[PDB]
């Protein structure tokens, strides 16, 4: 666990459209919600690859292990059924455990992704902002609608603002 | 106050929940099902290949050609078989099919099938064809199994008859013959004249000699004697010879088979349909891209693996934690 | 100095260690064992159901009713069987039980069991009961198998005897009969008068005819002839008829069985006990909530899976790193 | 790995009672050890759920795959034993690997938990404390026994102290 | 400017790529292969033990001692067998080996093997040895199977011959005998004088009686009669007795075997070699410390597990992300 | 993911000899590349242990499940082949999934290792350096070749330099 989701960012945003991770701003001229297509798409690609891998790699033969028997060959009939059942028990346990294991990792992956996004924004601003410890950043200078975009697209330069701080 | 920008994540209106290794019932924004739970509830064609319903006949009666059964002469292939466990028709004349378990397994599903005439029914010599009230046809006329010919005395004489078959088809060929055990030495005399008749069947790898086991059986229909029907797979280039002087159900029709044992004999009392799936169960057809299924352990074809489990939800979204 | 607050973690006095994928022998504060290594070392009841010890008798002698064996008349059920591999008693009269492997498998464990009299021992006709010095009872008196009756000539005459059994029990019924092969045609004359006697056994699905195979066998006890004992499972609503004029060990006692083949025939020389476990091995009973066990691959019931492994320690606590 | 346990917090605390993670303080009036029931219980719940999942999901049939055979049916007897052995080999490998895999994740989970606790305290104090980089925080102001508790229970407010710093 | 220190990681010149669960084709600095793909392409010794090539003979002809086959008298052990599927030599005299499937399985690989003389070929009594043009030896002289002796009439008389074998070797012993079925009752008279001859074979656990099944078979070579060869494993301390008055192929040479069924009968047309591996496939020998292999599902010995997969690359290094 | 590799440290160093993780310096007297034998060897030991565990634990019997059969025992022959195939399918899926799973964890382990190294250096310097947010540290004082070594070996003391800053 990475301490972001349900951690220091204690809640989610309903009305976050077409994205898992995003930004919420407020300058003198409004608000102010947008998904981060970069980290969201990359996350979407990973989940898709994971799901496809889990399914596509099962390319073997999985129908029943059984044959036809008359009523005089009960023993061989019972062994066939027991073996089919045993193979079934192996797949049953692995299926359940894999889902538990991967759900664990999927949730933590998302936690890691928004934490990395938060760290990414913190590194941009440097001393030009106060880290409120809740996912928010208080700017020490004024920020255009254009300025907010430079933060969102990673191109924010802390030198061209350091003095109003 | 000041200008501010915040980092956050998605929240939705979902009751969707998944289990993780460390936690039960965790709210998530989105998830998918791993296990297929939906089926047609019918018998479908399997990957383009239709099955064969055996109607009112058991497999045994169907494979030897019980006159009351629908003929398998026009069949080219089958993915699996459908059989009624309480089928009224089987071996119409009191008897047993030897090693029927193996035969059932080998005929559960065949990709290339065609009936063929091994030996001409009149090329055997001076013998008559026997019909019986036990094996009446669709009309009501006395008949007998289509694949076998019951040879009896002709003009008070049963000569030593001997014919052989040469597997020239290039594929495996199923051959059927039979031995009739009369109620008494008097009946084998009435039917075959010869005292203590025999039948000798041989290939170049094995040879069997059959004699008659006279006695009264607690039979069915009209009869009280007993028939034993045997079979053998003749491989490409192999030959099987039959020699007998009585009590011999001679081979007439055999089967040319390729890619067999690929099926199943379903006994489930569900209905046949026009659908086509890649996986058939004894409960219905399954058509899904999912790799697991908890519907029926009895399944055939390109199937999801059957597992003993409730639905399994794979998380795709993130933990659904409500709005601040 | 100033006021201060610190964040830290637990350390203990443990030599407890676990292996991880990336590191061997990592100190941890706490851990649990996944594999069960403890057992009773005894034969216990399995989930409330007591087994059956065969005493000094092999399964063969027990199932046909060797007079020297303890009777199975009072048995209602068994979870598994206990057999001494070097048991002195078996088929007391020189003979073999046909297809005994299958029978052993089917009788390894049965949930519903009861002996029953198929056909009255005196309802057969004009024949006497044969006893022998080979099959003496608990007293020392000449006897024979409990489940079979050795029919011989009465008043210098062996008539054609014929009785049939009707499975009305609603469950599967095990039936046993036998053929006696005398040392010479002289002995079958002395015993059965009739030259070349036969036995015909039939249901509505199969029919077998037995003849005598005279000769001197390198036998045991007193005798030098040979017996062959056969069996068949009669399904609910089925009937089996016996007809013979000599050399016939007739059925008397059969077995009504339901839910069978659910057991095991243990041959281990350990002791039987008053304990009750959910898993029995050939080495002892296991009672644990753990899902793995490295004790014995030979196990029956609600068991932990046997694995080839030393103890496996699952870490619960954290890395035990000592105090600053 | 998260760098806390056996990392920048280079040692554990013997005499930490009824907890895995906790606090050690020192003001003018004493010391000063207490477990954090919040993060400890949550961690206990997870380990318990993990252990139970591993065990409870094995709900199949795991006794031997074998039957009874006479001495004339050796081949079928050998195939039954080989199949039972093969099924056993699958479970053997999975058991060993799962324990190795999960022990890895359990240890790292604990590492992550105390790291998240450390970060949680650091966010509380903000500029009111010096991060010594060893799990300790040097307060720039005085701290009551009451003040220490507000830090431990998350309710510490950096505004009501920022000036003595 | 100022003094500065930086933290970084390794980058290389690699096209090396691995797949992860979350991403395909990720560049890494180093990786290893899990699956063995290389083999010798030959038949090698298996863990120090050489196999046995059957030359131009099938297993059946080899195990009974077809004179045209190389003798197995000097063999001490074998890891596996090499057989040509279209081998010209087998049962030289028209016949079949009973239960040959089981025997093939039991003789696929044996750790302790030695031929031995069960019963002296002249200790039987007043009978002659029969040789035939069907079983000529390396020279061209009429002979017969090495392990069997074809007993015929001597001085117009075939006496009742009876010899027995005592398993004193301490190990399991394979015994072979046979029954000859002449073309007619005239031939059994010419060969054995006695009308309707028999053969009785017995241990203390079982007894079989054989009679002759006269008739003309569609044979090969010169002959038109038929032989049936049977076998039995005699356990330590057990004894088998043979009694006959005609039509009897008597046992001469048997086999003392320990640790058997540990092999395979390869029919692959590859070449035998001087190499030595711990895993032999029908395609070549494998020598690797890797635990997986995608070469051949048909494998024997201390092998990597066969899996249906392309090469699997385990990442060892880190993500290869190029220089700033 | 830990955000270091291909993250805030956006590229690797070719010509990093005998190591996975290392340092690049520049003072008045040169440059300046060296592997960190400590964290590199520890990482090497872990990967080695992982690889060995994966291979060494497969100590069972993995050759074919099959026997010898004649042409009259086709059914038992087919069941043997189907069972062998089924066992093969279990190993096939597990092999593929394990490699995917472990490659995921191996890559993230490396990411975590250099992130921990970066954090380790940041804790050393404290206020004596500016964190440039790209893996580099700008020293506020002068740094000997000896001084650089004290940073690399962990023994750098921020008190004996705090004043030139
Ligand atoms: C069919 O069998 C006969 C009998 O010998 C043989 O001559 C012929 O070659 C066989 N047919 C073929 C295709 O060879």
CATH number at residue A130: 3.90.20.10
Q: For the purposes of burial, counting CB atoms within 10 Å of the CB of C139, is it exposed (0-12), middle (13-18) or buried (19 or more)? A: exposed
Residue A70 in contact with partner chain C when CB distance is under 8 A: no
Q: For the purposes of burial, counting CB atoms within 10 Å of the CB of F114, is it exposed (0-12), middle (13-18) or buried (19 or more)? A: buried
Phi-psi region of A137 (alpha: psi -120 to 50; beta: other; left: phi over 0): beta
Q: Six-digit token pair at B102?
A: 């193996």
Which residues contact residue F58 at a Cβ distance below 8 angstroms, ignoring those fewer than 6 apart?
D93, E291, E305
For residue B86, CA distances in Å to B54, B95, B267, B268, C207 come to: 12, 18, 9, 11, 21
Taking alpha carbons only, the member of C44, C174, C180, C206 closest to residue C104 is C174
* 3 state SS for B36-100: ECCCCCEEEEECCECCEECCCECHHHHHHCCCCCCCCCCCCCECCEECCCCCCECCCCCEEECCH
Task: State the Cα angle at C298 between C297 and C304, rounded to 5°.
Answer: 65
DSSP label of C270: P
**Which residue's structure tokens are 């799936």?**
B277
Residue C21 in contact with partner chain F when CB distance is under 8 A: yes
What is the number of other CB atoms lying within 10 angstroms of the CB of residue C17? 14
Taking the centre of ligand 1 as the mean of its atom positions, its distance from the CA of residue B167, in whole angstroms, is: 8
Task: Find the helix packing angle between F74-125 and A74-125, rounded to 10°.
Answer: 20
Taking alpha carbons only, the member of B225, B158, B224, B222 closest to residue B191 is B158
Residue A1 in contact with partner chain D when CB distance is under 8 A: yes
Taking alpha carbons only, the member of C196, C181, C125, C130 closest to residue C157 is C125
Taking the centre of ligand 1 as the mean of its atom positions, its distance from the CA of residue B166, in whole angstroms, is: 7
Partner residue opposite C200 with nearest CB, options B96, B215, B219: B215
Q: Specify the number of domains making up chain A.
A: 1
β-bridge pairing B172-181 and B265-266: unpaired
DSSP of F20-82, one letter per residue?
Answer: SEEEEEEBTTB--EEE-HHHHHHHHHHHHHHHHHHHHT--S--S-------TT-HHHHHHHHH
Residue F50 in contact with partner chain C when CB distance is under 8 A: yes
Nearest-angstrom CA–CA distance, A77 and B104: 13
Task: Indicate the SS3 state at residue A53.
Answer: helix
Give yes or no for residue B239 CB within 6 A of ligand 1: yes
Which residues contact residue D146 at a Cβ distance below 8 angstroms, ignoring those fewer than 6 apart?
none
Q: In chain A, what is the greatest distance between 2 CA atoms, to the nearest angstrom?
A: 94
Q: Six-digit token pair at E47?
A: 């863990």
Nearest-angstrom CA–CA distance, D92 and D114: 34
> Which residue has its alpha carbon closest to ligand 1 atom 14?
B237
Taking alpha carbons only, the member of F34, F18, F10, F13 closest to residue E11 is F13
Nearest-angstrom CA–CA distance, C191 and C133: 16
Nearest-angstrom CA–CA distance, B316 and B250: 67
- Give the helix/strand (H/E) hosting F124: helix F74-125
Taking alpha carbons only, the member of F85, F78, A87 closest to residue B262 is F78
DSSP lists the bridge partners of residue B243 as: B162, B200
Distance of CA A143 to the CA centre of its chain: 30
Nearest-angstrom CA–CA distance, F150 and D114: 28
**Which residue's structure tokens are 């508790």?**
D149
Task: Find the helix packing angle between F74-125 and A37-56, rounded to 10°.
Answer: 150
Tallying the residues shown for chain F, one arrives at 165
Taking the centre of ligand 1 as the mean of its atom positions, its distance from the CA of residue F42, in whole angstroms, is: 75
Which residues contact residue B141 at a Cβ distance below 8 angstroms, ignoring those fewer than 6 apart?
B131
Inter-chain CB pairs, A–C, below 8 Å: 14
Ligand 1 pocket test target in B118, B166, B173 with most atoms within 8 Å of CB? B166
Q: Which value in Å is the resolution of this experimental model?
A: 2.5
Nearest-angstrom CA–CA distance, E164 and E203: 9
- CB of C49 within 8 A of CB of D58? no
Nearest-angstrom CA–CA distance, C150 and C154: 12
Nearest-angstrom CA–CA distance, F89 and F85: 6
User: Do the chains contact at F71 and B233, CB–CB below 8 Å?
Assistant: yes
Residue A90 in contact with partner chain F when CB distance is under 8 A: yes
User: Do the chains contact at D97 and F123, CB–CB below 8 Å?
Assistant: no
User: Do the chains contact at B198 and E215, CB–CB below 8 Å?
Assistant: yes
Q: Six-digit token pair at B168?
A: 């020239």
Q: What is the dihedral of CA B66, B68, B73, B75, to 10 degrees?
A: -100
Give yes or no for residue B123 CB within 6 A of ligand 1: no
Q: Determine the structural domain holding residue A32 and report its residue range.
A: 1-165
Nearest-angstrom CA–CA distance, D141 and C3: 7
Instruction: Return the residue of E nearest to F45 by Cα.
Output: E316
Q: How far is A58 from chain F (nearest CA, A)?
A: 6
Q: How far is D69 from chain E (nearest CA, A)?
A: 14
Give yes or no for residue B164 CB within 6 A of ligand 1: no
β-bridge pairing C35-36 and B110-117: unpaired
Nearest-angstrom CA–CA distance, C311 and D13: 29
> Which residue has its alpha carbon closest to ligand 1 atom 1?
B166
Residue C185 in contact with partner chain E when CB distance is under 8 A: no
Q: How far is D75 from chain C (nearest CA, A)?
A: 13
Instruction: Return the residue of B nearest to F90 by Cα.
Output: B305
Taking alpha carbons only, the member of C302, C242, C221 closest to residue C44 is C302
> Which residue has its alpha carbon closest to ligand 1 atom 2?
B166
User: Do the chains contact at F85 and A109, CB–CB below 8 Å?
Assistant: no
- CB of B142 within 8 A of CB of B131? yes
Q: How far is A50 from chain F (nearest CA, A)?
A: 9
Q: How far is B111 from chain C (nearest CA, A)?
A: 31
User: Do the chains contact at B316 and A51, CB–CB below 8 Å?
Assistant: yes
Residue A41 in contact with partner chain E when CB distance is under 8 A: no
Nearest-angstrom CA–CA distance, D62 and B162: 57
DSSP lists the bridge partners of residue B98 as: none
Nearest-angstrom CA–CA distance, B279 and A63: 8
Phi, psi dihedrals of residue F126, rounded to the nearest 5°: 55, -130
Which residues contact residue C125 at a Cβ distance below 8 angstroms, ignoring those fewer than 6 apart?
C159, C161
Q: How far is F145 from chain D (nearest CA, A)?
A: 25
Tallying the residues shown for chain A, one arrives at 165
- Give the helix/strand (H/E) hosting F108: helix F74-125
Phi, psi dihedrals of residue A117, rounded to the nearest 5°: -70, -40
Q: Six-digit token pair at F122?
A: 């940041």
What is the number of other CB atoms lying within 10 angstroms of the CB of residue C274? 8
Taking the centre of ligand 1 as the mean of its atom positions, its distance from the CA of residue B124, in whole angstroms, is: 19
Domain boundaries, given as residue ranges, for chain C:
1-49+271-324, 50-270
DSSP label of B304: P
Taking alpha carbons only, the member of B233, B220, B226 closest to residue B247 is B226
CATH 3.30.1370.100 fits E50-270, yes or no: no
DSSP label of D71: T
User: Do the chains contact at A86 and D65, CB–CB below 8 Å?
Assistant: yes
Q: Six-digit token pair at C136?
A: 């003496």
Phi, psi dihedrals of residue B147, rounded to the nearest 5°: -80, -15
For residue D149, CA distances in Å to C94, C224, D120, D153 come to: 91, 98, 14, 6
**Which residue's structure tokens are 């070549």?**
E284
Instruction: Return the residue of B nearest to E94 by Cα.
Output: B204
Q: Six-digit token pair at A103?
A: 């759900």
Q: For the purposes of burial, counting CB atoms within 10 Å of the CB of A153, is it exposed (0-12), middle (13-18) or buried (19 or more)? A: exposed
Taking the centre of ligand 1 as the mean of its atom positions, its distance from the CA of residue F3, in whole angstroms, is: 77
CA contacts within 13 A on the Cβ side of C234:
27
Determined by which method? X-ray
Chain breaks after residues in chain A, where C lies over 2.5 Å from next N: none
Nearest-angstrom CA–CA distance, B151 and E66: 41
Partner residue opposite F57 with nearest CB, options D2, D83, D97: D97
Contacts of F100 in chain A (CB under 8 A): 53, 57
* 3 state SS for chain E: CCCEEEEEEECCCCCCEECCCCCCCEEECCEEECEECCCCCEEEEECCECCEECCCECHHHHHHCCCCCCCCCCCCCECCEECCCCCCECCCCCEEECCHHHHHHHCCCEEEEEEEECCCCCCCCCCEECCEEEEECCCCCEECCCCEEEEECECCECCCEEEEEECCCCCEEEEEEEEEECCCHHHHHHHHCCCCCEEEEECCCCEEEEECCCCCCCCCCCCCCEEEEEEEEECCCCEEEEEECCCEEEECEEEEEEEECCCCEECCCCEEEEEEECEEECCCEECCCCCEECCCCCEEECCCEECCCCCCEEECCCECCCEC
Q: Six-digit token pair at B153?
A: 């005395």
Q: Six-digit token pair at E46?
A: 């298996």
CATH 2.10.77.10 fits B1-49+271-324, yes or no: yes
Contacts of C181 in chain E (CB under 8 A): 207, 209
Strand order in the sheet with B35-36: B35-36, B292-293, B305-306
Contacts of B305 in chain D (CB under 8 A): none
Q: Six-digit token pair at F141?
A: 């004082």
Rg (chain B; Cα; Å): 29
E211-238 burial, b for 16+ CB within 10 Å, e for fewer? ebbbbbbebeeebbbbbbbbbbbbeeeb
Nearest-angstrom CA–CA distance, D16 and C255: 68
- CB of E222 within 8 A of CB of E134? yes
For residue A154, CA distances in Å to A127, B9, C215 come to: 16, 18, 102
Q: What is the dihedral of CA E37, E40, E41, E45, to 10 degrees?
A: -130
Prior bond of F32 cis (ω within 30°) = yes
Residue A101 in contact with partner chain B when CB distance is under 8 A: yes
- Give the helix/strand (H/E) hosting D54: helix D37-56
Residue D121 in contact with partner chain C when CB distance is under 8 A: yes
């Amino acid at each position: 666990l990475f301490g972001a989701i349900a951690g220091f960012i204690e809640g989610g945003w309903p009305g976050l459209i077409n994205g898992w991770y995003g930004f919420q701003h407020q300058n003198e001229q409004g608000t102010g919600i947008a998904a981060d297509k970069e980290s969201t798409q990359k996350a979407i690609d990973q989940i898709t690859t994971k799901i496809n891998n889990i399914i596509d790699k099962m390319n073997g033969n999985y129908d029943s292990i059984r044959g036809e028997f008359n009523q005089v060959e009960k023993r061989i009939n019972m062994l066939a059924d027991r073996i089919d059942d045993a193979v079934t028990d192996i797949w049953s346990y692995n299926a359940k455990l894999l889902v538990l294991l991967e759900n664990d990792k999927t949730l933590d992956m998302h936690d890691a992704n928004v934490k990395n996004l938060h760290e990414q924004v913190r590194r941009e601003l440097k001393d030009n902002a106060i880290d409120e410890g809740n996912g928010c950043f208080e700017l020490l200078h004024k920020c255009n609608d254009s300025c907010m975009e430079t933060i969102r697209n990673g191109t924010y330069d802390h030198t061209e603002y350091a003095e109003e701080s | 106050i000041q200008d501010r920008i915040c980092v956050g994540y998605l929240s939705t209106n979902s009751s969707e929940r998944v289990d993780t290794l460390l936690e039960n019932g965790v709210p998530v924004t989105s998830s998918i099902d791993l296990i297929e739970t939906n089926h047609t509830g019918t018998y479908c064609s399997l990957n383009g290949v239709s099955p064969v319903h055996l109607g009112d006949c058991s497999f045994e009666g169907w494979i030897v050609g019980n006159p009351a059964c629908t003929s398998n002469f026009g069949i080219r292939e089958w993915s699996y078989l459908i059989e009624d466990p309480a089928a009224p028709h089987g071996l119409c004349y009191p008897g047993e099919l030897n090693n029927n378990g193996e035969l059932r397994h080998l005929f559960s599903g065949i990709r290339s099938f065609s009936r063929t005439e091994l030996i001409p029914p009149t090329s055997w010599g001076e013998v008559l064809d026997g019909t019986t009230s036990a094996c009446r046809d669709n009309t009501g006329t006395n008949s007998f199994y289509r694949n076998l010919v019951w040879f009896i005395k002709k003009n008070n004489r049963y000569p030593v008859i001997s014919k052989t078959y040469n597997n020239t088809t290039g594929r495996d060929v199923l051959v059927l013959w039979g031995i009739h055990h009369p109620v008494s030495v008097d009946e084998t005399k009435t039917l075959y004249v010869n005292s203590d008749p025999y039948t000798l069947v041989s290939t170049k790898s094995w040879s069997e000699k059959y004699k008659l086991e006279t006695g009264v059986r607690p039979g069915y229909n009209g009869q009280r004697s007993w028939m034993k029907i045997y079979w053998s797979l003749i491989h490409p280039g192999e030959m099987i010879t039959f020699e007998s002087n009585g009590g011999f159900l001679a081979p007439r029709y055999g089967y040319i088979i390729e890619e067999y044992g690929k099926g199943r004999i379903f006994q489930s009392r569900i209905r046949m349909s026009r659908c086509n799936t890649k996986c058939q169960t004894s409960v219905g057809g399954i058509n899904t891209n999912r790799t697991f299924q908890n519907i029926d352990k009895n399944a055939l074809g390109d199937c999801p693996k059957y597992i003993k489990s409730g639905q399994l939800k794979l998380a795709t979204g993130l933990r659904n934690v409500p709005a601040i």
